[PDB]
Amino acid sequence: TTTQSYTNSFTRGVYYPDKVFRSS
Amino acid sequence: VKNKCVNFNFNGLTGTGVLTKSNKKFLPFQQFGRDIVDTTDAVRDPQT
Numbered sequence: 001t002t003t004q005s006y007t008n009s010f011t012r013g014v015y016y017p018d019k020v021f022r023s024s
Numbered sequence: 025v026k027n028k029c030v031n032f033n034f035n036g037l038t039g040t041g042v043l044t045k046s047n048k049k050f051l052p053f054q055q056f057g058r059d060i061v062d063t064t065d066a067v068r069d070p071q072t
């Protein structure tokens with residue numbers, strides 16, 4: 001069995017779009 | 025050759041300039057470099 005409760009993701013789930021180094 | 029004006033063809037990335045050692049913190053998946061105006065800055069050597 002399983003449940004389908006709903007929660008908030010907050011600020012989460014951001015990856016690096018590219019493979020390009022960046023600073024400041 | 026480093027510290028000398030050379031035409032580079034790094035993995036198909038053509039250009040001109042001077043290269044040297046760096047202390048960047050490239051993540052293992054990182055391959056290229058750039059700046060805030062999107063100009064290629066650092067290239068990871070494919071054979072080093």
Ligand SMILES: *[C@@H]1O[C@H](CO)[C@@H](O)[C@H](O)[C@H]1NC(C)=O
Nearest residue numbers: 035052067068069070071072
């Ligand atoms: C490149 O290939 C040579 C020959 O197998 C090997 O000795 C060397 O460690 C390799 N270097 C890299 C960075 O893969």
